[PDB]
Design goal:
The structure is cut from a larger assembly and holds chains A (63 residues), B (102 residues), C (46 residues), D (93 residues) and E (77 residues). Chain B is an all-beta fold. Chain B has no helices and 9 strands. Chain D is 29% helix and 38% strand. Classes of the chains: A mainly alpha (63), B mainly beta (102), C mainly alpha (46), D alpha+beta (93), E alpha+beta (77). Chains in contact: A-D. The structure holds 4 RNA strands. Chain E: Keywords: Ribonucleoprotein, Ribosomal protein, RNA-binding, rRNA-binding.
RNA sequence: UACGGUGCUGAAGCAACAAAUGCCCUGCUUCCAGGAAAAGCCUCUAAGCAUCAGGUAACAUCAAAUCGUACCCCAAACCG
RNA sequence: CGAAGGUGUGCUGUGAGGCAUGCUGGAGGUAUCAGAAGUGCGAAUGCUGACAUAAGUAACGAUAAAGCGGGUGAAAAGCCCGCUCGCCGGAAGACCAAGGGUUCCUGUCCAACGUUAAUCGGGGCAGGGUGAGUCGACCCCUAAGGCGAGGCCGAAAGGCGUAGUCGAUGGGAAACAGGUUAAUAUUCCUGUACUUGGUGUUACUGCGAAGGGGGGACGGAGAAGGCUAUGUUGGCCGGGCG
RNA sequence: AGGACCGAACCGACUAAUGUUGAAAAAUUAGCGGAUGACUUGUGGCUGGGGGUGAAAGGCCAAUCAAACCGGGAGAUAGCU
RNA sequence: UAAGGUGAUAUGAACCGUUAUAACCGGCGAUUUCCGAAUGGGGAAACCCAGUGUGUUUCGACACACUAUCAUUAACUGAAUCCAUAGGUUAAUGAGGCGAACCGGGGGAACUGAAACAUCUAAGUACCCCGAGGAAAAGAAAUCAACCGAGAUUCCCCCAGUAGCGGCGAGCGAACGGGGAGCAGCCCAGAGCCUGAAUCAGUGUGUGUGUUAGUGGAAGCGUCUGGAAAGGCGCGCGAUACAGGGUGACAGCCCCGUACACAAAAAUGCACAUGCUGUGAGCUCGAUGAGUAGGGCGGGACACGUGGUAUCCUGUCUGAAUAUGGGGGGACCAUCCUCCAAGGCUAAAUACUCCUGACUGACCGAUAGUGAACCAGUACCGUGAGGGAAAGGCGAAAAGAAC
């Protein structure tokens, strides 16, 4: 997912931005630190995916 | 690129297994390879009180050097060195001595 | 008996601390020698 | 108001202990590890909006990191912040 | 500092020599005086710290040319 | 009563006298050696603003952030 | 089919030395003839490391002092519990500041640390623990003093200093009782409070300063008077009649 | 009233003994002086090396003082060991 | 580029990838908390406290940006005072700090040597301070030479431990001239003719080459000892490749490489070519650097210590001629020769190595070589500046010892 994020509008990367943080990131920090979450790789891939959305969002907004 | 690689059948050139064929299990970035049924060490490990306890003397394979193996030709039935040629933009390996692409 | 080192953090810092080495020419040369010698702690700050 | 991007990064873990446990089962307070730069307004707003409960008041201490060692190599852990979040009479989590 | 504002005369260094030739360090100082110069073109008194041969060169070159040199080299008067 | 305690219940709960180096007291008396400053605080107005702004009073409501808080501290934890 | 090195033996040269070989070792050595030297150690109160000697010797850190029973343990003079005994009690008690920085509390281990043993510990390992509108800091204000735009001065670096700006050891708003944790509490809980700002409504209304005045605002000693903390005794209440 | 008197805290340090590879690189014990003053103490500040400060001893200036400490000139120089 | 990866101690768990959007390598971007010149004010560095403006469909609270000083320039304001200057406000541009050596300049010791010591030496060294560059500095004759000539500066070898200076002690010590490295000349003080004429500087573009990833890269088997072969023995092959490193002992032919031949989407350094802008060629005529040269006094630099001392620099007092003129030619005068100060620019030869790459050593091999082969400027010591260690090697492979 790098062209897929590249082909939306600024509003839609703000939506999937807030959903990467909201649904994914926070619930996996809370789920990870409360004994659950066997699958730990999700933390990494979510974090890098927020990096992609902020990158494309900085590239799309202005310069 | 790398001459001996992952799913490949080799023969062993030096030591304890000289002339034994076998398939490469994996290949370690130390420049070593683990080849099945070849460099068998008799480890004996402790039954850790965590998840399952085998105990005993487990006979594993050890990593031999990449330079101690060469891939088995099977058209001549001997060891053979590997080169790299280009075919249709693909860098392919080929056997030396009959020049056959692998 | 009353030994010489009677510690105070405020006098340690006002005297030999970083904002007090940087405050003058010669303390900046002190910091330059401590960085050049390559030193884990330059001043005594904490 | 506090933006939601800030407000997600503040809460970090629920704190499990016996002081925490007796705080929940005896005085409505949930104890949780927060961001080190998180203020009490941020923690209150983030529990209001991320566990959808009603917070009465927050009390924040900062816990100092312990100097451990491996072998003969020391190291301080890391300071964190712990928030005693006193909820109202209607709560579950 | 003791610099003539016209000629640029710093204090220089030297030796007190004696009759036994014992060298000692000394400073030769310029004859710096603070004199107030009437400029007719501006109708004002510009006060300068001149030497006593900065006044010779002001008497010869004129005060306007000298002030043009000080304004030229960024000496503020 | 995992004898470690844990809950429940709980009477009287007054007076006299003595009394500080603490309080009235930043007082009072006295003495020369003649005993910080600036803000908060209370007031006065100038420029300005004048049926606005501001001030006062009552009521309501919101806010009071941040860092320290363990433990030793005449000492086996500080300086030796 | 065993190098250097190490350790013995035998032979040999006038000597420094050489040669052969057993055992250890486990991978390098080097003829001859030349070349270059960090080229030869017993001394330097030589430098560094190791190991002796006195020597199983002095000592084991206040002459406040211990005794017994029981428990745990592989093992108890020292740990835990109990009963006695002694010591401090204007301290050897309690609370802080400075300073330290997890030593606090719990479980667990006894290698080293503890001048002995240790099951114990301020030791090792792991987990826990520090909750504030009212306490303190930050903050507002300043003293000594620092720094200091401009500025005056000075070979350069820089010195001094005006406006200012910092600087507590001083001045400035407000919370007490009771309960609770193994470990925090004027912070948590219960009860009862108080303070300062913002905003809104309502009623009345002249408000307004890096400006004026007051106040803050402040010595040593002494003397009583009125109190309180606190204590003693009686009354009351509960228990005892040895 | 008092650089007043006796005497604890507090500041000091006159004598003796111990200690002198100490419990301690200056103390302990028993006595001793001052103890409302030219006192004592906390916190901060200022003075710096031929310089400070000194009720003056050449005392003190981080267990160092007839010229601190650190670094450098520097492998000073040593007709001496 | 790729069949394997998610850095190490350091294994695990959870996964990603295998013909291409795993991972790894490179170019260009994005993010880049706080402290630090630190720059909004302050401060005990990594913290405390703001102001101003813009925006925020819960705008009772948030988010972003700007706000240091100084120099220069401009605009608007603006005292004593009328005009005006000082001052004030705002904007634009630049600077500030760090860094090992080399370089120029401002200051500048003493121990030591003289077998004492004061002139002298050490020594314009150590050190302090300012400034600059990839080099700096110097530089285009008011220079030598010597009646012949040379032709800017810098560096090297002689000259030559020479002439000289010297309590004529200790010591200091040239130039002329010769041989080389390198070679380059110009502009303003000034008008007219004439214009873009060479010249460089700033940029675009094109070409060539280099850097930053890479690609291909020859040729061996049998037998004996052995734990293991690259070793012994026997027979082959490569070489524009027998530099080196690893592989279970010593490998040209096992592996990585080496010789050799190629490779860049992008960013770049250098060199040509070329577009634009700025800049000025060339001709005639004129001018041709005044508190200056020189002097008196004091001091310094010249190899030269005031001496018979030329020359240069100037703190102080003075003070010309200005091409029918002036400086020098080692006191000084005359004759003769040579040159044109009081304005400035200028490449190369030259000096150095914080840092990068490749290669090399009759350099060291763990008490050596860096203080530091190892998580070393660390532990530790000291208030501080500062001082400053010790410590490498199981094995071929952890098969690192089940029971």
């Amino acid at each position: 997912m790098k062209a897929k994020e590249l082909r939306e509008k600024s509003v839609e990367e703000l939506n999937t931005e807030l959903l990467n943080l909201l649904r994914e990131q926070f619930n996996l920090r809370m789920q990870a630190a409360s004994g659950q979450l066997q699958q730990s790789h999700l933390l990494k891939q979510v974090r890098r995916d927020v990096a992609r959305v902020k990158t494309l969002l900085n590239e799309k907004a202005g310069a | 690129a790398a001459k001996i690689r992952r799913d490949d059948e080799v023969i062993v050139l030096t030591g304890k297994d000289k002339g034994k064929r076998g398939k490469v299990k994996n290949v370690l970035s130390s420049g070593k390879v683990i080849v099945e049924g070849i460099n068998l060490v008799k480890k004996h490990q402790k039954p850790v009180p965590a998840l399952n306890q085998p105990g005993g003397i487990v006979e594993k394979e050890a990593a031999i050097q990449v330079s101690n193996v060469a891939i088995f030709n099977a058209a001549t039935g001997k060891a053979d060195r590997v080169g790299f040629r280009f075919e249709d933009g693909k860098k392919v390996r080929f056997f030396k001595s009959n020049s056959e692409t692998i | 008996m009353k030994r010489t080192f009677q510690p105070s953090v405020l006098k340690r810092n006002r005297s030999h601390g970083f904002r007090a080495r940087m405050a003058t020419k010669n303390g900046r040369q002190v910091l330059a020698r401590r960085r050049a010698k390559g030193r884990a702690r330059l001043t005594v700050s904490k | 108001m506090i933006r939601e991007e800030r407000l997600l990064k503040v809460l970090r873990a629920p704190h499990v202990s016996e002081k925490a446990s007796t705080a929940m089962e005896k005085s409505n307070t949930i104890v949780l590890k927060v961001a080190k730069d998180a203020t009490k307004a941020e923690i209150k707003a983030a529990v209001q909006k991320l566990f959808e409960v009603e917070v009465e008041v927050v009390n924040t201490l900062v816990v100092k990191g312990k100097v451990k060692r491996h072998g003969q190599r020391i190291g301080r852990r890391s300071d964190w912040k712990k928030a005693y979040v006193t909820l109202k009479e209607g709560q579950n989590l | 500092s003791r610099v003539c504002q016209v000629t640029g005369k710093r204090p220089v260094t030297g030796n007190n020599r004696s009759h036994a030739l014992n060298a000692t360090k000394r400073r030769f100082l310029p004859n710096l005086h603070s004199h107030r110069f009437w400029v007719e073109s501006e109708k004002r008194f510009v006060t300068l710290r001149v030497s006593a041969k900065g006044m010779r060169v002001i008497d010869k070159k004129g005060i306007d040319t000298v002030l043009a040199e000080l304004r030229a080299r960024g000496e503020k008067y």
